[PDB]
Design a protein around this ligand. Structure first.
Ligand SMILES: CCC(=O)SCCNC(=O)CCNC(=O)[C@H](O)C(C)(C)COP(=O)(O)OP(=O)(O)OC[C@H]1O[C@@H](n2cnc3c(N)ncnc32)[C@H](O)[C@@H]1OP(=O)(O)O
Ligand SMILES: CCC(=O)SCCNC(=O)CCNC(=O)[C@H](O)C(C)(C)COP(=O)(O)OP(=O)(O)OC[C@H]1O[C@@H](n2cnc3c(N)ncnc32)[C@H](O)[C@@H]1OP(=O)(O)O
Lengths: 261, 247, 145, 247, 261, 247
């Protein structure tokens, strides 16, 4: 007989559940949605298409080769969809596994989606929720960051790029949103900072809260990094859907024209 | 000045211990033609050095980190000062040489409230869109995202070199072992293996992130030849009216 | 410097003209370059005689020692046709034993008749020369043991 | 023909055993609009199918392997015919749909003396040079360089798909175990690890070489959708008078 | 006390040594040179700049993660040099380790030098000596071949690409020379075929010899695949140098003009 | 080698009788600088000669017919090899020099079953699209469509020359007489006037299909001069992604 099939459904359900029900429950108790729920809420019903659903990281040291550390999808859900009938390419960080930290497969998926979008001429929307880079991955995460940065810079002025931060974002996960055209934040659940409060206390000898160090209010009222802040994930996604209608799909297109009553 | 001039006094300029600083202007003087260097903004944001020099008679732009001031960390003023200079050098077909010795970005609430992310993005974009030949030399260390911001190989860089004292790592060793080994409670050995395996340019060199590990005394002769073959560099990019600088 | 001896060679070094005039230690000489290959072979007519030389660089010369010498099937036992003219008669048929100085075929060319002889003792396996045939130079005629 | 119609008849068209063959023309007819197919050279080099069809009303060129004759192997005539058809389709902005079921090239001294390398290069160049949208579906197998020849993802392909019965590997299990395992001198279970670890589309999916592992019944609905996304595909290539095809 | 320096020197020595002196001797007894000696003969003296010297394979299957089979360089030596003062980019496949089979690192290095050459506008010369692909590595070798093939196709008509087969080239190592502008072979030591004589006997059931199946004479007399054949490696390299003196560096350059006498 | 060097040895290299053959390699060596010629594919498809040489110092590509082998008739391998060489020379701005002595294509059922039409179209296309300067010299014969395949004037050729022994006609005297005068039954004289009238280069010269009828000894001094003025040749063609070679 052939055992390939039931393995395919096991991997499918593992990818759908991400990193188990306990991590999803922990995600929900913080007032935050999961990556796939955000994708479903952002795109038109029955229009999302996956990409690189069966990928895992190539790490082999620090015990990352064990089957307990192998998650299909690898902390990002990438694909394409339609908003109000117009094509768009989306990726969503999965904080469920490894805190959404970027690895080789993660950056490979993001780069592939960005390359496809720049080939076809469609905007890129990115929902960011990641704790930084995988330390045990090695210098591969730095290469992934650099590749993503190069693709953001190359696509700048060609296709619109939108970033929505829906959770904590530390380390190298903050330069990519800054290179995009627009940046939106979610109140009380999203953060943006180079270094955590513990490092600030260790170095500069001052106590600071994460909310008052990199919170939505700080980045929308006194630093000028983010453009808008929204009440929560559902409101943020609805406002992102409303805002996407204003922009053209590419720089080759004129300004969108809607019917006026 | 002969192009293949040996520069032996750089063989031991970098101290063996990582807590002691040196002067990058000394290296810049030792490498460039006739040890002549026109420095731009010499009294502002001293933790970064930018200027104009000559290699084999061809004018070049020099950007480097200064471990003497602020331990070589990057901040808002240095980011802007480097970014605009790199943009000007790229705009007028001037090759760029980068010297990398940076532990990361300067932490604190003052930097976050000032918008350190935007200016770091400015510098990263400035090195990212450059189409002029770029030669990079890592002297002591390049930690974290700063390693990407300092004209790494993955930003369409041309040639990347690392001295034997280079350290291309994700972050500091102590933080790495504290984030990897949480409940191991046996960090005494973990320090030994981590330092022996990852506190060196070997992880970057084993996967082609740096072209070669060169002796410092051959730095100048290594650069000039590259500038001889990269003078005809020509690449193409997607059409646009302009891009969106993260100003 | 050849084997210690130091000489000076001067000329216009016109590599296209058939004749080259050089001066070696004051002595004026005239040479011809009949052939030249990228592998280093060169046929030079000097003092009226054609010399074949092989010039290599020192690194190439020292690396040529690892090259295996190709085995060649020219282990005698075959005589070509020095005459490019016409053979009158052949005195050797297949299966006949030959010896040193034993005439094989009589072939003439350009107002001269020559009867080539076998240079070694043996027995022919196949004869490719027949009477009244036009045979060019360097053509196999006899295949002895 | 509605662009989202299902094709359940393709669910079990691929036989379980790797020796039994099937007609790829049946799959082509089941996938295209109104089951209408204009075949090119139907009686010459029958181990490959090339032709014109319609998807959602748009003209598409179809190239596929025929396991019915010659077990789907590639040879001189098939490579030449496929290369010429692909070149024509690319030259006139006609999208390409590829169905891959190939175990490699045809062995024999006649193929070697006829120049199988040149014609394989012909087909490889034809698939690599094309800048039109290219949708690829692997049905049963793809072994060795033939997998590269048949418009793989790494030839700047757009979308690549694999059925659950697909299998991508360097070559057959026998050759692999006989080249890698020599001193083990007992191929009893090592065959088991190799088979149930590499005789499946799982490695390529894990590295990301195929976009998804789709059910056959959705194939048409999977293609047409993609085929209208890629209608605006536009890529740039370095300037040249013309290239030197390996003819 | 820093241990980095002597490790660097040790791996320099092992890289120049290839895969040990024993295999170098066994490879010299066949009448063939090594990759480094071939490059030394091909290019101008004191002009070879080598790139990616410490690059090693990342395979971690079938026990190849052990240090006993981690060769720096990884079966290929790549760089740039000058022939009679004109720039060129060269790669030479090293038959010493693993029969010269291509890995991810091998294809990565070749792709790197090809990208550098096409960016600069200089020809590419490849001294091919490879037994096929690493079976232990799997689909990575196929990806590497496909990347090389894509680069060869893209560079066709832009820069001259020359292949010199100086050893047995089986499997996928035959398509890349076929896509290059010219193909030269060496008598009695180089072979070109897709399947070996054993597979031909297994399938077609007829005896064939290595040389008659893929020798230089077969491909230069009755197959029309190779353009010229030379006696040995030194003669082949000298003739390749002389032939390279003819061609221009790029398609955006006029035909080279020398001086006449 | 001076560009005006005469070659009197070519004045009698063409035998008077149409049956005896000569060596085109001697003509090529006499014409080129220092008699240095880099043969390409010397031992395969020997009825055609292709290679690289130098003229007044500049690199030129040479394609010519070899009357020694198969009386200069074209076939599969010769057409393929010549087409590939001509395409490579055109792609890299290398001027082409052609020597024409061809009675036509090689007849037989082996050539028809192998697709002689396809490869003949390959070669004809190879000369047809060439935009580099091309100089053609007809030595003895140019019969039928082969004359068109051999870089005729009407393929946008630059300069075409004919030696006094040249002969351009639809076919040989025989077939022309038994076709034109099939019913006349007066071939004994019809041969005489047909040979006297059309078995010479005058029909091509008076209609302007050859620039001049030149003495062989002045061939080289002619070609160099043309290569001095055609170095700045620049033509324009309709836009296309790529064409469709008859491969
Ligand atoms: C290129 C620039 C670089 O080198 S960036 C290096 C990584 N920088 C970091 O800040 C990583 C440290 N992580 C953190 O501080 C926290 O996770 C932060 C960012 C504050 C998130 O806040 P919080 O909502 O409380 O998450 P948490 O404490 O519950 O952590 C849950 C799981 O997330 C994981 N995680 C997070 N980041 C990484 C990472 N870089 N690599 C590997 N794992 C990471 C943690 O392992 C943690 O696991 P667990 O569920 O507690 O067992
Ligand atoms: C994608 C394209 C593909 O599927 S390629 C599949 C590989 N095809 C093959 O035929 C196997 C490769 N090997 C060969 O063909 C022959 O051994 C050739 C290349 C002709 C070697 O000739 P010969 O000198 O007479 O044999 P040898 O014993 O001296 O050398 C063999 C040593 O080199 C090694 N070798 C060779 N090829 C590979 C390979 N692809 N992968 C891994 N190793 C390879 C062998 O392991 C062998 O090593 P060892 O010295 O016996 O320890």
């Amino acid at each position: 007989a052939t055992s390939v099939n039931e393995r395919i459904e096991n991997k499918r359900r593992t990818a759908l559940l991400g990193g188990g029900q306990r991590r999803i429950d922990a995600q929900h108790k913080r007032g935050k949605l999961t990556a796939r729920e955000r994708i479903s809420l952002l795109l038109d019903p029955g229009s999302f298409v996956e990409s690189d659903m069966f990928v895992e990281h190539r790490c082999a040291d620090f015990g990352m080769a064990a089957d307990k550390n192998k998650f299909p999808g690898d902390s990002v859900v990438t694909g394409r969809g339609r908003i109000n009938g117009r094509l768009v390419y989306v990726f969503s960080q999965d904080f469920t596994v490894f805190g959404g930290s970027l690895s080789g497969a993660h950056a490979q998926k993001i780069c592939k989606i960005m390359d496809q979008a720049i080939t076809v001429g469609a905007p890129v929307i990115g929902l960011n929720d990641s704790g930084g880079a995988r330390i045990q991955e090695g210098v591969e995460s730095l290469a992934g960051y650099a590749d993503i940065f190069l693709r953001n810079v190359t696509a700048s002025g060609v296709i619109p790029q939108i970033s929505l931060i829906m959770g904590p974002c530390a380390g190298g996960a903050v330069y990519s949103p800054a290179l995009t055209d627009f940046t939106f934040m979610v109140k009380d659940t999203s953060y943006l900072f180079i270094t955590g409060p513990d490092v600030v206390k260790s170095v500069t000898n001052e106590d600071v809260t994460q909310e008052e160090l990199g919170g939505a209010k700080t980045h929308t009222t006194m630093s000028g990094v983010a453009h808008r802040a929204f009440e929560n994930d559902v409101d943020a996604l609805c406002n992102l859907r409303d805002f996407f209608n204003y922009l053209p799909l590419s720089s080759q297109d004129p300004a969108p024209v809607r019917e006026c009553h | 000045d002969p192009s293949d001039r040996l520069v032996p006094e750089l063989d031991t300029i970098v101290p063996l211990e990582s807590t002691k600083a040196y002067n990058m202007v000394d290296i810049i003087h030792s490498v460039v033609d006739e040890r002549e260097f026109f420095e731009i903004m010499p009294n502002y944001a001293k933790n970064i050095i930018v200027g104009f020099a000559r290699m084999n008679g061809r004018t070049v732009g020099i950007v480097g980190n200064q471990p003497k001031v602020a331990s070589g960390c990057l901040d808002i003023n240095s980011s802007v000062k480097g970014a605009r200079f790199v943009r000007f050098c790229d705009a007028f077909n001037i090759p760029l040489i980068t010297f990398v010795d940076v532990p990361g970005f300067l932490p604190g609430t003052a930097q976050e409230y000032g918008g350190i992310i935007r200016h770091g993005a400015k510098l990263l974009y400035a090195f990212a869109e450059a189409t002029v030949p770029k030669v990079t030399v890592i002297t002591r260390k390049a930690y974290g995202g700063a390693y990407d911001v300092m004209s790494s190989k993955h930003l369409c860089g041309d040639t990347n070199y690392a001295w034997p004292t280079a350290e291309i790592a994700v972050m500091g060793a102590k933080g790495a072992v504290e984030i990897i080994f949480k409940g191991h409670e046996n960090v005494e050995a973990a320090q030994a293996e981590y330092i022996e395996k990852f506190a060196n340019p070997f992880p970057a060199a084993v996967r082609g992130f740096v072209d070669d590990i060169i002796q410092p005394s051959s730095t100048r002769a290594r650069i000039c030849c590259d500038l001889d073959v990269l003078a005809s560099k020509k690449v193409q990019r997607p059409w646009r009216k302009h891009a969106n600088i993260p100003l | 410097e050849v084997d210690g001896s130091k000489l000076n060679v001067t000329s216009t070094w016109n590599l296209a003209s058939p004749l080259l005039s050089v001066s070696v230690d004051g002595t004026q000489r005239t040479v011809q370059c009949l052939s030249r290959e990228a592998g280093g072979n060169m046929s030079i007519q000097f003092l009226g005689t054609v010399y074949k030389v092989n010039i290599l660089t020192r690194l190439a010369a020292e690396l040529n020692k690892f090259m295996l010498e190709k085995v060649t099937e020219d282990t005698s036992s075959v005589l070509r046709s020095p005459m490019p003219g016409v053979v009158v008669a052949v005195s050797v048929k297949p299966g006949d034993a030959v010896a040193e100085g034993q005439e094989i075929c009589v072939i003439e060319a350009m107002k001269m008749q020559n009867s080539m002889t076998a240079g070694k003792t043996g027995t022919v396996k196949s004869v490719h020369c027949q009477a009244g045939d036009t045979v060019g130079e360097g053509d196999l005629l006899v295949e002895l043991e």
